[PDB]
Amino acid sequence: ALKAPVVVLGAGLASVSFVAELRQAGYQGLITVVGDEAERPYDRPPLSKDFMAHGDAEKIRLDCKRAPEVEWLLGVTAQSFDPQAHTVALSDGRTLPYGTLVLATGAAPRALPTLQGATMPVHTLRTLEDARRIQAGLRPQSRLLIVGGGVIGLELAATARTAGVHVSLVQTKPRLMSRAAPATLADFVARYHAAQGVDLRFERSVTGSVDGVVLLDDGTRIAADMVVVGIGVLANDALARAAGLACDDGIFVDAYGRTTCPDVYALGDVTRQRNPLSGRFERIETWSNAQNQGIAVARHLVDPTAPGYAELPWYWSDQGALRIQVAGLASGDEEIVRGEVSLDAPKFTLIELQKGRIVGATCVNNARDFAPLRRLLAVGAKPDRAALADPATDLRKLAAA
Amino acid sequence: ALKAPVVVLGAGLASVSFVAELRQAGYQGLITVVGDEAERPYDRPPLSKDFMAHGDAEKIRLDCKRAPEVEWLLGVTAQSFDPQAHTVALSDGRTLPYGTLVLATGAAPRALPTLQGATMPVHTLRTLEDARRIQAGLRPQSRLLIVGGGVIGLELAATARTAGVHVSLVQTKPRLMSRAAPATLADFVARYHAAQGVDLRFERSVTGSVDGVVLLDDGTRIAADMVVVGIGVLANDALARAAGLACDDGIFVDAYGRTTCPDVYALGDVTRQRNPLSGRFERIETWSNAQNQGIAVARHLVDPTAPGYAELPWYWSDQGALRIQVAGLASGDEEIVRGEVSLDAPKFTLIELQKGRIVGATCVNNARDFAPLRRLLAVGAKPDRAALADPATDLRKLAAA
Ligand SMILES: Cc1cc2nc3c(=O)[nH]c(=O)nc-3n(C[C@H](O)[C@H](O)[C@H](O)COP(=O)(O)OP(=O)(O)OC[C@H]3O[C@@H](n4cnc5c(N)ncnc54)[C@H](O)[C@@H]3O)c2cc1C
Numbered sequence: 001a002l003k004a005p006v007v008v009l010g011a012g013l014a015s016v017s018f019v020a021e022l023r024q025a026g027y028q029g030l031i032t033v034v035g036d037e038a039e040r041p042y043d044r045p046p047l048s049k050d051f052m053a054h055g056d057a058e059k060i061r062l063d064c065k066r067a068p069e070v071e072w073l074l075g076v077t078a079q080s081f082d083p084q085a086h087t088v089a090l091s092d093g094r095t096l097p098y099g100t101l102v103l104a105t106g107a108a109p110r111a112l113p114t115l116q117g118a119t120m121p122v123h124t125l126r127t128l129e130d131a132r133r134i135q136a137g138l139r140p141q142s143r144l145l146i147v148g149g150g151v152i153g154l155e156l157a158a159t160a161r162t163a164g165v166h167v168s169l170v171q172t173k174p175r176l177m178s179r180a181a182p183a184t185l186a187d188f189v190a191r192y193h194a195a196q197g198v199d200l201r202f203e204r205s206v207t208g209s210v211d212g213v214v215l216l217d218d219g220t221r222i223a224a225d226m227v228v229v230g231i232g233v234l235a236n237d238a239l240a241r242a243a244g245l246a247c248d249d250g251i252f253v254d255a256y257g258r259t260t261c262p263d264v265y266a267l268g269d270v271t272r273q274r275n276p277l278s279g280r281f282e283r284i285e286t287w288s289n290a291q292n293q294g295i296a297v298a299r300h301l302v303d304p305t306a307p308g309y310a311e312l313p314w315y316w317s318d319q320g321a322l323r324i325q326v327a328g329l330a331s332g333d334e335e336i337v338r339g340e341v342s343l344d345a346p347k348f349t350l351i352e353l354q355k356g357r358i359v360g361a362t363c364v365n366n367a368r369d370f371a372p373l374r375r376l377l378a379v380g381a382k383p384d385r386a387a388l389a390d391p392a393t394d395l396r397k398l399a400a401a
Numbered sequence: 402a403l404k405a406p407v408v409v410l411g412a413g414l415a416s417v418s419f420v421a422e423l424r425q426a427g428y429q430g431l432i433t434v435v436g437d438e439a440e441r442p443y444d445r446p447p448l449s450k451d452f453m454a455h456g457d458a459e460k461i462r463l464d465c466k467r468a469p470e471v472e473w474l475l476g477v478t479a480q481s482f483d484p485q486a487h488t489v490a491l492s493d494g495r496t497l498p499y500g501t502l503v504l505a506t507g508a509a510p511r512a513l514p515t516l517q518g519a520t521m522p523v524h525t526l527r528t529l530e531d532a533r534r535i536q537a538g539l540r541p542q543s544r545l546l547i548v549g550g551g552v553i554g555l556e557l558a559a560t561a562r563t564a565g566v567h568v569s570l571v572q573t574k575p576r577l578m579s580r581a582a583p584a585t586l587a588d589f590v591a592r593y594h595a596a597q598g599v600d601l602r603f604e605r606s607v608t609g610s611v612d613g614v615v616l617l618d619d620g621t622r623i624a625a626d627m628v629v630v631g632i633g634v635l636a637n638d639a640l641a642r643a644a645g646l647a648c649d650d651g652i653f654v655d656a657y658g659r660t661t662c663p664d665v666y667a668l669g670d671v672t673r674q675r676n677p678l679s680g681r682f683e684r685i686e687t688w689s690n691a692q693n694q695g696i697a698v699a700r701h702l703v704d705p706t707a708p709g710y711a712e713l714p715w716y717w718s719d720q721g722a723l724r725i726q727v728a729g730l731a732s733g734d735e736e737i738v739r740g741e742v743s744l745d746a747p748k749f750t751l752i753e754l755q756k757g758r759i760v761g762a763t764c765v766n767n768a769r770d771f772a773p774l775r776r777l778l779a780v781g782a783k784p785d786r787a788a789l790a791d792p793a794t795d796l797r798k799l800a801a802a
């Protein structure tokens with residue numbers, strides 16, 4: 001089952017969380033981690049947040065303390081693995097044996113085909129190197145165009161506006177945060193960004209670019225000094241595909257993290273896995289999944305009596321004055337709005353229900369509500385809906401009881 | 402790898418094909434097949450075709466000759482399996498041990514929620530029992546309503562019209578055969594059925610039924626003596642789900658038929674698997690997949706040097722005077738029409754191309770063209786497109802050369 005030695009491909013959050021849990025759970029055999037970035041393992045959420053603003057990479061490193069006795073091969077790329085021979089081929093000419101192989105290779109930004117031959121700066125934002133490159137171009141009064149209205153693009157928009165950068169944003173869908181964000185939240189977020197001076201363009205797509213100017217499918221133009229593309233990510237599943245594992249923009253895994261290849265597991269952004277709320281497979285793209293799935297897979301490898309991964313999805317986003325938290329599903333058959341939705345000191349909570357059962361929640365500038373809502377969500381609570389609306393109600397009381 | 406004894410759950414085409422290939426490839430260990438239907442293994446395509454018309458089940462049995470030394474437990478249901486203990490629990494109180502378990506449990510017709518409490522005959526068409534029940538109600542001059550415009554519904558429509566039954570058909574999508582059929586084919590097929598007296602209703606859905614009359618979402622009614630629902634199927638993946646395998650309306654498998662659980666494989670209609678043409682995972686619902694995937698998985702179990710499953714998708718449908726064959730993808734960036742599309746002695750070929758490469762083909766009443774087209778499709782041929790259109794061209798010549 002858990003056969004030594006353990007080899008993990010990728011040295012991001014999922015990998016670090018996994019190897020720390022292996023050690024904490026009592027596994028004492030070899031652990032070797034192969035990471036292609038020549039960087040002390042680091043967390044990505046700061047890259048479009050405080051790092052983009054203040055630039056200190058020594059504030060964003062992951063804690064590998066709970067992972068003693070691990071050899072981290074940084075700056076080296078796993079090029080293939082042979083699941084029959086139980087070996088991994090590295091870019092430095094070495095080969096690693098494994099008893100258990102764990103693919104934690106994450107995902108990479110999708111390129112925008114229409115900007116392939118661009119002769120102006122076009123960047124994506126995934127790595128520390130990416131963040132440093134973008135930051136170097138955030139000149140005050142310069143013009144930035146962001147393609148894509150997902151959370152990372154919006155976080156960059158906010159950061160850029162704070163830095164005195166003019167920002168335009170092109171979104172093909174009619175709303176921001178089209179993936180896993182309630183419409184009510186998305187509409188409010190657009191109003192917020194518009195009020196901060198972001199030039200939002202909905203239902204437009206980029207058709208190309210010429211001499212520092214981007215072209216749109218409504219026949220118009222947007223001049224910019226830099227483009228940052230953020231239209232989503234694609235799983236880094238090439239090694240799995242080549243080795244014969246089941247993959248489709250993501251490695252399919254069960255709740256134990258098992259791939260279709262015996263002795264090969266996968267975790268984090270690279271996986272396509274069951275969302276327990278929808279009961280469908282999806283590629284989850286969140287910090288909490290990377291950490292939680294890594295921990296759960298490790299725990300069950302060391303102790304097979306442990307349950308499989310079962311945590312429900314959630315994320316957060318920091319966009320200027322908006323501290324956004326979202327859990328579960330973006331929609332059901334009912335939304336309850338707790339508080340007023342207003343640009344004047346924004347503070348509200350949304351609750352999504354399905355036939356009376358909580359299936360999702362949102363908090364904007366209300367961290368205290370979010371924890372009890374996630375507990376109610378976890379057990380599929382069916383609370384009195386007037387109480388959920390009634391601002392006199394205390395959610396922590398409800399969650400404990 | 403291939404560990405004896407072998408246990409297969411399900412006794413349909415995929416199972417029979419798999420166990421016959423195990424024997425032909427030289428595996429001599431135990432094989433036991435558990436089949437819930439108390440029927441000599443039989444093929445399903447005749448059920449909406451010649452069987453529905455002539456009623457002789459002894460013309461539709463599968464050949465288990467190439468599968469000697471197999472114990473077939475007919476009329477018994479596998480209730481669960483324990484992948485740790487390597488056992489299967491049967492409905493008759495017995496337990497089977499396995500070295501290799503193969504899930505070939507197929508799929509079952511989706512029920513129509515709006516007809517759940519119906520007080521008129523409502524059937525689906527999957528099994529021999531289903532076919533016999535429907536056939537018993539095909540009284541001449543009776544009225545049949547079919548819900549769903551997939552191939553099986555259309556085959557039943559044709560059979561019913563031939564039997565003198567009045568037929569109406571409700572399809573929610575704007576075209577028939579919305580799944581994997583080129584629009585050009587679908588439009589022609591509608592014209593054909595309309596000309597044979599089928600009352601087609603597009604872009605309508607069933608909202609309910611009252612006293613022998615079905616209600617539609619345009620506020621209208623259709624009276625019928627029998628409803629046959631054919632809005633698709635759902636994978637029979639309950640045992641896999643309960644045992645912890647990765648599933649999502651279908652058991653995920655790689656090209657070797659491996660599930661996420663070691664020593665457990667899956668084949669046929671129950672699987673979600675890579676379509677090599679699209680490069681995406683899909684649940685394939687075809688006779689050729691059931692046979693071909695079963696054979697390929699068996700071959701590779703006995704001989705691990707054999708390639709994984711690699712066949713490209715295709716199916717056929719017999720609808721009255723229309724002998725339809727479809728291979729590959731329903732669309733690309735180009736369609737070439739070979740011949741005239743006409744209700745007067747229908748006979749034509751479609752070819753779908755993507756950047757010059759053949760990615761799909763259709764033949765209506767032209768079996769001789771279909772085989773060379775599938776060969777061109779298999780190697781991704783990029784033939785001269787004027788020649789593909791030019792009716793003077795011989796496709797068999799092209800395929801050999
Ligand atoms: C800018 C940014 C902001 C974000 N903000 C938030 C947030 O506020 N909240 C939130 O919920 N989530 C956020 N996320 C998402 C989050 O960070 C991811 O879900 C998380 O990084 C996934 O971790 P991972 O370990 O699975 O993958 P990764 O972090 O991508 O780590 C995988 C590593 O493996 C490497 N690798 C790939 N292939 C190979 C190979 N063949 N050999 C060796 N190494 C390889 C990769 O280069 C990478 O270093 C953000 C992400 C970004 C980029």
Ligand SMILES: Cc1cc2nc3c(=O)[nH]c(=O)nc-3n(C[C@H](O)[C@H](O)[C@H](O)COP(=O)(O)OP(=O)(O)OC[C@H]3O[C@@H](n4cnc5c(N)ncnc54)[C@H](O)[C@@H]3O)c2cc1C
Pocket residue numbers: 410411412413414415416435436437438444445446447448449477478479480505506507508526527528553637640668669670671686687688689691715716717718719
């Ligand atoms: C009416 C009809 C017409 C068709 N026409 C065509 C056609 O012209 N061309 C074409 O390409 N395809 C056609 N098909 C599709 C085709 O027949 C299927 O793709 C094929 O039957 C799939 O084979 P299978 O072995 O995977 O599944 P199945 O045939 O469904 O066999 C699975 C068996 O396992 C049984 N089972 C399920 N669970 C258990 C359990 N727990 N224990 C024991 N047994 C279990 C099932 O009841 C079933 O008997 C048609 C299908 C139907 C129903």
